[PDB]
């Protein structure tokens, strides 16, 4: 029998988009989806609803919290330092969430972050499903019970080693472990420290789920299932679905002028601003390769326009071979275009998948975020599908020569490391796109959800 599932993702494009890709996959199999979204954001989401008779949006009013910009709904509307306030706002939707569950009565609700939800759902006879679209390797490394019990004894040297029983080995740099140690105790909404929230979600939910497949994410999902004693499901890799909006002709025309495989595409998401020094090193590094490039970047900290912040003489040198641009673009459609030979990525979970299923060579430039960093290590050192840009051990900064080097290595047909990551990327692409991989992931997924509501 078909299920009725409610979706309550975090207020961010990086969560709304994959939750919507998955809803389309579930509705194709006959399940009804009640999709809770911020009110104004719904306009941007309609293009992705491929089953409007089965997927219904229910808007939420993102309540004012002191310090939150007027009308702000998602992390694309506020600086990264204001994320905790937006979380306080999402906590404050509790009243409209209880009303929606009462009227719609789903059997399951997929959610992020809101650890007060399982109490509500069990009182209504609803099952709570904490559904992550980030890497289970990340949750495993930072939020398994062994880390939580040290409480305030957890320090930078502690986070250079995996927790007890962690299934794989990789090395973090000193500045990365320092990031993890300080950010985990920062309050993220309603006075709750970041890792304590999440741990509460993992502890109190009925079941846990992750984007991913057994062949990549399995070892981490197994570890989490033994640690928390409840089912940890895999949805399959959530392959991007086709939008009902074709590629903007301005970009199609401009991309179409380059020879196949020659363009470097660089994008670091929609949540972060580089510092001006690193903004310059990145762009000068791209220029040094001599390849055409398209860089999708916010203006650096302190600056409001790209043109203000460009290195001196930059526009006059690169001419028509390079564009630096600030707006939201159709990244999935760009990564599909045959001009793109190389993808310089911040290693966000969605961008990782979008790169893996395409032909571009991957250059990994993770920004300061636990999932980004761990994605980059796995991609660079375990799957070996891309080349990571060298950063200073203690300061976390790169040179333009390190950017130039990484792109040159993967674009050089005769370079053996470039050839090796190409071959490894093809192997991973062939697995993710295998005719029965996602379908049999979802087969198991839906069976296990059926068990959950039984
Ligand atoms: C400022 C950032 O704040 C925190 O991340 C905030 C970000 O979490 C990301 O999603 C994340 C979640 C997460 C995801 C969904 C959930 O339901 C949930 O309970 C947790 O958990 C993490 C746990 C970690 O130990 C480290 C992380 O980097 C993340 C993370 O990035 C979101 O995609 C972003 O939109 C959000 O801005 C972390 O401390 C991070 O390291 C730090 O750089
Ligand atoms: O200009 C942009 C910036 C980001 N994205 C999309 O936003 C998501 C960012 O997720 P993540 O890579 O941060 O996880 C991805 O689906 C990415 O394709 C766009 O479509 N356009």
Count CB neighbours of 320 within 10 A. 8
Count CB neighbours of 409 within 10 A. 16
Rounded to 5 degrees, what angle do the CA atoms 272, 277, 278 make? Answer: 50
CA-based torsion, 445, 446, 452, 454: positive or negative? negative
Within this chain, do residues 253 and 396 fall inside the same structural domain, yes or no?
yes
Distance between CA atoms of residues 126 and 343, nearest Å: 42
Token pair for 90: 């999402």
Q: DSSP character for 162? A: P
Residue ID of nearest Cα to ligand 1 atom 7: 369
Within this chain, do residues 388 and 422 fall inside the same structural domain, yes or no?
yes
Atom of ligand 1 nearest to the CA of 186: 39
Give the DSSP H/E element, type plus range, for residue 332: helix 331-335
Within this chain, do residues 269 and 408 fall inside the same structural domain, yes or no?
yes
Count CB neighbours of 201 within 10 A. 23
Q: What are the φ and ψ backbone dihedral angles of 154, each rounded to 5 degrees?
A: -75, 120
Within this chain, do residues 172 and 277 fall inside the same structural domain, yes or no?
no
Examine residue 244 and state whether it is found in any structural domain, yes or no.
no
Q: Ligand 1: which residues within 6 Å by Cβ? A: 10, 12, 14, 75, 80, 83, 112-113, 132, 134, 138, 142-143, 183, 194-195, 198, 201, 271, 368-371
Within this chain, do residues 329 and 293 fall inside the same structural domain, yes or no?
yes
Distance between CA atoms of residues 338 and 132, nearest Å: 31
Distance between CA atoms of residues 166 and 220, nearest Å: 8
Examine residue 36 and state whether it is found in any structural domain, yes or no.
yes
**435 annotated among ligand-binding-site residues:** no
Within this chain, do residues 20 and 168 fall inside the same structural domain, yes or no?
yes
Hey, which of 270, 296, 333, 357 would you mutate to test ligand 2's pocket, going by the most ligand atoms within 8 Å of its Cβ? 270
C-alpha closest to that of 183 among 150, 142, 217: 142
What 3-state class would DSSP assign to 362? strand
First to last CA, the chain: 12
Count CB neighbours of 56 within 10 A. 13
Count CB neighbours of 104 within 10 A. 16
**10 annotated among ligand-binding-site residues:** no
Within this chain, do residues 190 and 315 fall inside the same structural domain, yes or no?
no
- CB-based burial, 284-311: b 16+ in 10 Å, e otherwise: bbbbebebbbbbbbbbbeeeeebeebbe
Q: Which residue has the tokens 């930072």?
A: 142
Count CB neighbours of 182 within 10 A. 10
- E strand intervals along 176-298: 207-210, 232-234, 263-267, 293-296
Within this chain, do residues 204 and 284 fall inside the same structural domain, yes or no?
no
CA 204 – ligand 2 centroid, Å: 30
Token pair for 33: 């989806």
Examine residue 217 and state whether it is found in any structural domain, yes or no.
yes
16, with CB counted inside 10 A (0-12, 13-18, 19+), is: buried
Residue ID of nearest Cα to ligand 1 atom 3: 183
Atom of ligand 1 nearest to the CA of 14: 33
Number of folded domains in the chain?
2
Hey, which of 14, 148, 371 would you mutate to test ligand 1's pocket, going by the most ligand atoms within 8 Å of its Cβ? 371
Within this chain, do residues 269 and 212 fall inside the same structural domain, yes or no?
no
**450 annotated among ligand-binding-site residues:** no
Token pair for 94: 């509790």
CA 199 – ligand 1 centroid, Å: 12
Rounded to 5 degrees, what angle do the CA atoms 34, 37, 40 make? Answer: 135
Distance between CA atoms of residues 238 and 64, nearest Å: 33
**402 annotated among ligand-binding-site residues:** no
Q: How far is CA 16 from CA 10, 19, 22, 305, 311, in A?
A: 7, 5, 10, 27, 35
Beta carbons of 241 and 21 less than 8 angstroms apart: yes
Distance between CA atoms of residues 408 and 25, nearest Å: 38
Q: Ligand 2: which residues within 6 Å by Cβ? A: 13-14, 17, 267, 269-270, 296, 328-329, 331-332, 348-351, 354
**372 annotated among ligand-binding-site residues:** yes
Examine residue 23 and state whether it is found in any structural domain, yes or no.
yes
Within this chain, do residues 189 and 266 fall inside the same structural domain, yes or no?
no
Rounded to 5 degrees, what angle do the CA atoms 71, 56, 190 make? Answer: 40
Distance between CA atoms of residues 203 and 411, nearest Å: 46
CA 171 – ligand 1 centroid, Å: 20
- CB-based burial, 417-445: b 16+ in 10 Å, e otherwise: ebeebbebbeebbeebeeeebbeebbeeb
Atom of ligand 2 nearest to the CA of 296: 1
Residue ID of nearest Cα to ligand 1 atom 23: 139
Q: Give the domain extent around 198.
A: 4-239+435-452
What 3-state class would DSSP assign to 228? helix
Within this chain, do residues 210 and 297 fall inside the same structural domain, yes or no?
no
CA 156 – ligand 2 centroid, Å: 30
C-alpha closest to that of 34 among 120, 90, 137, 111: 111
Residue partners of 184: CB distance under 8 A and separation at least 6? 142, 154, 193, 194, 195
Give bridge partners of residue 129 from the DSSP assignment.
110, 207
Distance between CA atoms of residues 29 and 443, nearest Å: 10
- E strand intervals along 98-200: 108-111, 127-132
As annotated, the active-site residues are 15, 112
**241 annotated among ligand-binding-site residues:** no
CA 249 – ligand 1 centroid, Å: 35
Distance between CA atoms of residues 237 and 210, nearest Å: 9
Q: What are the φ and ψ backbone dihedral angles of 317, each rounded to 5 degrees?
A: -85, -50
* CATH number, position 10: 3.40.50.2000
Within this chain, do residues 201 and 339 fall inside the same structural domain, yes or no?
no
Rounded to 5 degrees, what angle do the CA atoms 28, 32, 38 make? Answer: 105
């Amino acid at each position: 029998s078909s299920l009725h599932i409610a979706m309550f993702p975090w207020f961010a494009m990086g969560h709304l988009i994959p939750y919507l890709h998955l809803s389309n996959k579930l509705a194709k199999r006959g399940h009804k989806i009640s999709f809770f979204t911020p009110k104004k954001t719904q306009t941007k989401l309609e293009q992705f609803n491929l089953y409007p008779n089965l997927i219904t949006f229910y808007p939420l009013n993102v309540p004012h919290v002191d310090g939150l910009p007027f009308g702000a709904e998602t992390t694309s509307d506020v600086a990264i330092s204001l994320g905790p306030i937006l979380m306080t706002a999402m906590d404050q939707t509790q009243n409209q969430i209880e009303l929606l569950l009462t009227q719609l009565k789903p059997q399951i609700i997929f959610f992020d972050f809101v650890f007060w939800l399982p109490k509500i759902t069990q009182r209504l006879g609803i099952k709570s499903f904490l559904y992550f679209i980030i890497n289970p390797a990340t949750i495993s490394y930072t939020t398994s019970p062994p880390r939580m019990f040290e409480a305030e004894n957890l320090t930078e040297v502690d986070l250079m080693k995996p927790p007890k029983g962690y299934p794989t080995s990789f090395n973090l740099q000193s500045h990365e472990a320092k990031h993890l140690a300080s950010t985990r105790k920062i309050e993220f909404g309603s006075g709750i420290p970041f890792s304590v929230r999440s741990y509460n979600c993992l502890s109190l939910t009925d079941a846990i789920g992750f984007k991913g497949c057994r062949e990549i994410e399995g070892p981490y999902v197994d570890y989490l299932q033994e640690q928390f004693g409840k089912p940890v499901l895999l949805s399959g890799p959530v392959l991007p679905e086709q939008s009902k909006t074709a590629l903007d002709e301005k970009w199609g025309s401009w991309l179409g002028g380059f020879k196949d495989g020659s363009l470097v595409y660089c994008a670091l998401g929609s949540e972060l601003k580089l510092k001006q020094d690193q903004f310059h090193e990145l762009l000068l590094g791209l220029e040094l390769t001599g390849f055409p490039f398209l860089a999708i970047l916010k203006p650096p900290v302190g600056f409001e326009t790209i043109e203000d912040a460009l290195p001196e003489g930059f526009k006059e040198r690169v001419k028509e071979k390079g564009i630096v641009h600030s707006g939201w673009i159709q990244q999935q459609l760009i990564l599909e275009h045959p001009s793109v030979g190389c993808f310089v990525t911040h290693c966000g979970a969605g961008s990782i998948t979008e790169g893996l299923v395409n032909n571009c060579q991957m250059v990994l430039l993770p920004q300061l975020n636990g999932d980004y960093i761990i994605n980059a290590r796995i991609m660079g050192r375990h799957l070996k599908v891309g080349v990571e840009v060298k950063k200073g051990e203690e300061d976390g900064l790169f040179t333009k020569e390190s950017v130039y080097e990484a792109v040159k290595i993967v674009m050089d047909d005769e370079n053996e490391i470039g050839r090796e990551v190409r071959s490894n990327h093809t192997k991973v692409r062939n697995l993710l796109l295998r005719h029965d991989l996602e379908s049999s992931c979802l087969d198991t997924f839906c069976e296990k959800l059926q068990e959950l509501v039984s």
